[PDB]
Design a protein around this ligand. Structure first.
Ligand SMILES: COc1c(CCc2ccc(NS(C)(=O)=O)cc2)cc(-c2ccc[nH]c2=O)cc1C(C)(C)C
Length: 557
């Protein structure tokens, strides 16, 4: 029961790959320790292949089937619709990988006859054939990190034609099913502010709260054939059109369970028997499977009043404590149960008795004060990776602007406000690109966002307090300051100085730019302005935001 089988053919790049941080005239104003920053390339794919290749063994007990029966009962209340070819085409990202059948992502979006005729023939093939393994491309992701070097992560995706078909059959399913099955436990339905609110209310709902996060080692590769068939049986509980039932069965048998792996040069690299990281169902499948295995593991470990917070393979558990020594024992039993279910740990889980000390996927709850002096909880993270990616994006244009996604999601943080907003607004002013729409990712989905709309977006996700936070925690200030010394980033006093200039420059431009100056950089001036709700914020169509996760799902708006 190996996750993969390999032939020896290399995982090849699509274009020229850079690993060393590119340097331009702007680099040194952000980061001076250039040797600390790197991008992963196909050169390291061989090491990743070794790490993700292992035998999986599953032992399914009564807690597992009990949880599954409950999940299927909730899944049976879901009614899902088939999307038209047109609706599926419009969710396709403009720069999505082109089809091997002579058309690209822009042909799909333009509803070109060639693209639409091919999608219709793939659809007919899914309906008539439910056995033939569907070909997939295996690629090394190009992602930027700070040292202390990770090997490249792998992306496995079917052809553009198949991806449009996945949208037709499962887009409505993967968007509505998880919240119905998991209720308040489904993390992707929340904005960062709603997530903090959920975590605080849960922490306060326990007499003696205890919390931990569970890190599964190579989650996608731990996903078995059984897990993928179980996900299909959950999707089948929905009230679906008979063509949608057939397409879901076919995509499961032919694509989701496994298939051959092809490199960018057309060579066979091997065969997958685990979760594909670049399919529509990656996020939803990972969410349901993680929740199923964790919920059953919580019952097996006799964890009292367990509240899950699940986003794909990201798992947070908040429960009733039984003292430090018993909690240590319970987590070992939880881990043992997760292991039997083929979800073994990377780093073993540690019990926490302070909400701020629970870290999941580099993120944690922290505290600051609003304009009135009131204590306000917000989500932050270690800023090393966001700052390393910002340095790369200072010298190179990338398909996904991590700085923009980071300003949106981490707007209330000390580091996004003082550094990211200051730096990138300074660049956009000099380049006359304030009105240019830029792509970023929110919960794996791609969005086109104009930086001039940032104050309204921030107000809608975090409220006006994101523009007024002050008196950050000494733990948080210290992590930011330590990160700056490590990377060779100028100190916070330099950023405050530069921000007064960026603010004045934005105010001079008037209009939406002046609003950016007023709201985003009010923290920089000694005589603060009283910030009132922005009328444009209410007009913002933020539907489709915070519904579901679509990581690897090829989703645009
Ligand atoms: C953790 O929440 C997240 C997640 C969720 C991350 C996540 C995605 C997928 C999986 N797993 S998978 C691949 O199986 O679907 C797990 C976690 C993402 C972000 C975020 C930050 C900056 C830009 N864009 C963003 O979306 C922020 C949070 C906040 C809300 C903490 C700020």
């Amino acid at each position: 029961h190996m996750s993969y089988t390999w032939t020896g053919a290399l995982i090849t790049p699509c274009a020229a790959e850079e690993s060393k941080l590119p340097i331009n005239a702007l680099s040194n104003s952000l980061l001076r320790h250039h040797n600390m920053v790197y991008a992963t390339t196909s050169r390291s794919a061989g090491l990743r292949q070794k790490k993700v290749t292992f035998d999986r063994l599953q032992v399914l007990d009564d807690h597992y089937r009990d949880v599954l029966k409950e999940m299927k009962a909730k899944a049976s209340t879901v009614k899902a619709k088939l999307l038209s070819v047109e609706e599926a085409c419009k969710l396709t990202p403009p720069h999505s990988a082109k089809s091997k059948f002579g058309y690209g992502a822009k042909d799909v979006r333009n509803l070109s006859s060639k693209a639409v005729n091919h999608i219709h023939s793939v659809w007919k093939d899914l309906l008539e054939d439910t056995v033939t393994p569907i070909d997939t491309t295996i690629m090394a992701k190009n992602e930027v990190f700070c040292v202390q070097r990770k090997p490249a992560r792998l992306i496995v995706f079917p052809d553009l034609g198949v991806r449009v078909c996945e949208k037709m059959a499962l887009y409505d399913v993967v968007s509505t099913l998880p919240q119905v099955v998991m209720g308040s436990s489904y993390g992707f339905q929340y904005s960062p502010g709603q997530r903090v609110e959920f975590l605080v209310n849960t922490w306060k709902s326990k007499k003696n709260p205890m919390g931990f996060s569970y890190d599964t080692r190579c989650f996608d590769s731990t996903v078995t054939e059984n897990d993928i068939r179980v996900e299909e049986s959950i999707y089948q509980c929905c009230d679906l059109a008979p063509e949608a039932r057939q397409a879901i069965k076919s995509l499961t048998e032919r694509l989701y369970i496994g298939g051959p792996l092809t490199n960018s040069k057309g060579q066979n690299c091997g065969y997958r028997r685990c979760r594909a990281s670049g399919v529509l169902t990656t996020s939803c499948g990972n969410t349901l499977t993680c929740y199923l295995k964790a919920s059953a593991a919580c019952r097996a470990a006799k964890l009292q009043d367990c509240t899950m917070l699940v986003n794909g393979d990201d798992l947070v558990v908040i429960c009733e404590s039984a003292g430090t020594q018993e909690d240590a024992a319970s987590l070992r039993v939880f881990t043992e149960a997760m292991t039997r279910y083929s979800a073994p740990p990377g780093d073993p889980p540690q019990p926490e008795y302070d909400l701020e000390l629970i870290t999941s996927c580099s993120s944690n709850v922290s505290v600051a004060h609003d304009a009135s002096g009131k204590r306000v909880y917000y989500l932050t993270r270690d800023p090393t990776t966001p700052l390393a990616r910002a340095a790369w994006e200072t010298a190179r244009h990338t398909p996904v602007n991590s700085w923009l996604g980071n300003i949106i999601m981490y707007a209330p943080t000390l580091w996004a406000r003082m550094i990211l907003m200051t730096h990138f607004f300074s660049i956009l002013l000099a380049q006359e690109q304030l009105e240019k729409a830029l792509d970023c990712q929110i919960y794996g989905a791609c969005y086109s966002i104009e930086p001039l709309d940032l104050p309204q977006i921030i107000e809608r996700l975090h409220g006006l307090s994101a523009f007024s936070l002050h008196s950050y925690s000494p733990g948080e200030i210290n992590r930011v300051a330590s990160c700056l010394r490590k990377l060779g980033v100028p100190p916070l006093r330099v950023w405050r100085h530069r921000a007064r200039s960026v603010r004045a420059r934005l105010l001079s431009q008037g209009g939406r730019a002046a609003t950016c100056g007023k709201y985003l950089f009010n923290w920089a001036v000694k005589t603060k302005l009283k910030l009132t709700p922005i009328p444009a914020a209410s007009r913002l169509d933020l539907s489709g935001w915070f519904v579901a996760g679509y990581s690897g799902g090829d989703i645009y708006h």
